[PDB]
Amino acid sequence: VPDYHEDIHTYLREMEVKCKPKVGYMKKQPDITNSMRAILVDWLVEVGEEYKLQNETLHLAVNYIDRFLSSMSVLRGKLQLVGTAAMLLASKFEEIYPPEVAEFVYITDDTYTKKQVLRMEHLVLKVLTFDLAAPTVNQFLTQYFLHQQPANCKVESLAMFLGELSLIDADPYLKYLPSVIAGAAFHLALYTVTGQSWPESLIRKTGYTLESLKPCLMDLHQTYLKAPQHAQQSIREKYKNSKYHGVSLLNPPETLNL
């Protein structure tokens, strides 16, 4: 009940700082790259589609991956094992019933055994110290959607699209807290669909002016402009569905009027 809207938002603002990954961790990974991470996240987008997982599950899994890779060095042959265990754990946390473990073996073309997946599960729980209720972009967007005048389903869908795109590219998006990315995604989506702008009601609530969102927004604008040429295309394909009003078929604005 809207009695807790404020309390929840304020509390999510507090927890997103605690569940934050280290920004420069890929530099300290000797065997893996942003580009590998990008391939991994893109693959997980597709897996969530195949298995009809909720979008929050994807967002959670990525949070778990980046926090894991912030303290644990991983060889390129095991990065997929990490991702797979992350997706299993996220599904357990978020889904009504998760896919069976066997499904998580199959999705890798049986490159790992069931036992390897399960013991990577254990290791990920250990490193994350069982702290799995991480705030996500998708949570902040969902709360921001209560402030549309009036609610517009292209705006929502496009904001979700932009939110997910940001999961793919560690540089730049690891620099920004989820509430900030959600802020930029919402404005850019609203702007793209209607020409309107980050509402004062959300400026009061988040304490974010449009100007404070500008660095993240310029990044997100470039990402949106360059989305059709990006090596990774799963999110674009996903958001072509009628479910989402084709938003990823709408044309991005060549300027932000900033």
């Binding site: 893996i32 590998m36 693959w43 390129r76 990065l79 997929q80 999705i107 890798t108 073309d109 490159t111």
Partner: peptide
């Protein structure tokens, strides 16, 4: 799919 096997993946890097």
């Amino acid at each position: 799919r096997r993946x890097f």
